[PDB]
Homo-oligomer: A and B are copies of this chain.
Amino acid sequence: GAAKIIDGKTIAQQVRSEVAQKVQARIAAGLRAPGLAVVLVGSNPASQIYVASKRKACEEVGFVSRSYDLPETTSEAELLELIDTLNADNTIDGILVHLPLPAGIDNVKVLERIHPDKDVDGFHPYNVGRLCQRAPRLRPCTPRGIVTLLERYNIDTFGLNAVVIGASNIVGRPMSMELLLAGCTTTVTHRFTKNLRHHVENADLLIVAVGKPGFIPGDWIKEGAIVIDVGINRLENGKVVGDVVFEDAAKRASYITPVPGGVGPMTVATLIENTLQACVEYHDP
């Protein structure tokens, strides 16, 4: 077999070009560019990689970006006050708070202080619950980017038997609610599942989000399945590989996302899309 590639690098470029074109049209009409704000408490190389990636995502489409770097000693009360200020700032469309926050700060209270209309990551419980109850607003980026992939490849979802491997808050759980919204029969597997293969073997649409290199072998995959690999696993040797053994799954799948170049770029593209949506639909209509 020769599965077709789900070329997320190319689809993400299309999404960024569409956003950039809408930003240019707003500018031409005398309207402000969307703005993204990133908040960090303390610093380290990883968090500065986080900031820089959000910065360059903004510059590729013409958003304004702002970064707050607060000292490690910042108190919960000071941080909630900053969130309040950003919630009230009409030039800010999206707020991101980088996690790990220092020991002693209630992470959940800070994140839930963000107004759901500026929660462009889509993780505020209000936004997750809206998605669950079929009235989505801002949606978690990785599942929404996967739905975009399926739509852009003209994959009919109604009636597919879809299996999600992994029940994380960031991917697996909201993925199940996106797939239900798209009319798939949905199964979520996780660490307590008896026999992963029996569920995987019947999946027309397989979403793998376990964070383990080469965990899913080609032999488990249903012939003709659509295989979406969310893993981005860094190996000793600098290479990045998926949660699925690509060479063996590609023998059986009809479509497959490579890693790198599949789901990865779509997650960032969906953050950007969400920020434009917040600006256009919720703030400056």
Q: Which residues of A are in contact with B by a Cβ distance under 8 Å?
A: 108, 123-130, 132-135, 158-159, 161, 167, 169, 173-174, 176-177, 180, 183-190, 192-194, 199
Minimum distance in angstroms from A188 CB to a CB of chain B: 5
Point out the residues of chain B lying under 8 angstroms from A186, CB to CB.
176, 187-188
A169-B134, A180-B188 known; A125-B123 Cβ under 8 A: no
Q: Within the complex, what minimum Cβ distance (angstroms) separates A97 from chain B?
A: 16
- Residues in B neighbouring A135, C-beta threshold 8 A: 108, 125
A74-B186 Cα distance, complex, nearest whole Å: 42
CA of A158 to CA of B135, assembled, Å: 30
Q: A132-B129, A135-B108 are in contact. Are A185 and B187 (CB under 8 A)?
A: yes
In the complex, which of the residues B128, B161, B183, B194 contacts A133, with contact meaning CB atoms closer than 8 Å? B128
- Nearest neighbor of A182 in chain B, beta-carbon distance: B192
A192 to B184, CA, bound (A): 7
> A interface, by DSSP: helix, strand, loop or mixed?
mixed
Complex alpha-carbon distance, A192 and B125, angstroms: 27
Instruction: Give CA–CA (A194, B186) in the complex, Å.
Output: 12
What are 28 residue pairs bridging A and B, where the CB atoms are less than 8 Å apart in the complex? A108-B135, A124-B129, A125-B125, A125-B126, A125-B127, A125-B128, A125-B129, A125-B135, A126-B126, A126-B129, A129-B130, A132-B173, A132-B177, A134-B173, A159-B193, A159-B194, A176-B176, A176-B186, A180-B190, A183-B190, A184-B192, A185-B188, A185-B189, A185-B190, A185-B192, A185-B193, A185-B199, A187-B187
A185 surroundings in chain B (CB, below 8 A): 187-190, 192-194, 199
Contact status B180-A173, CB under 8 Å: yes
Q: Which residues of B contact A159 (CB under 8 A)?
A: 192-194
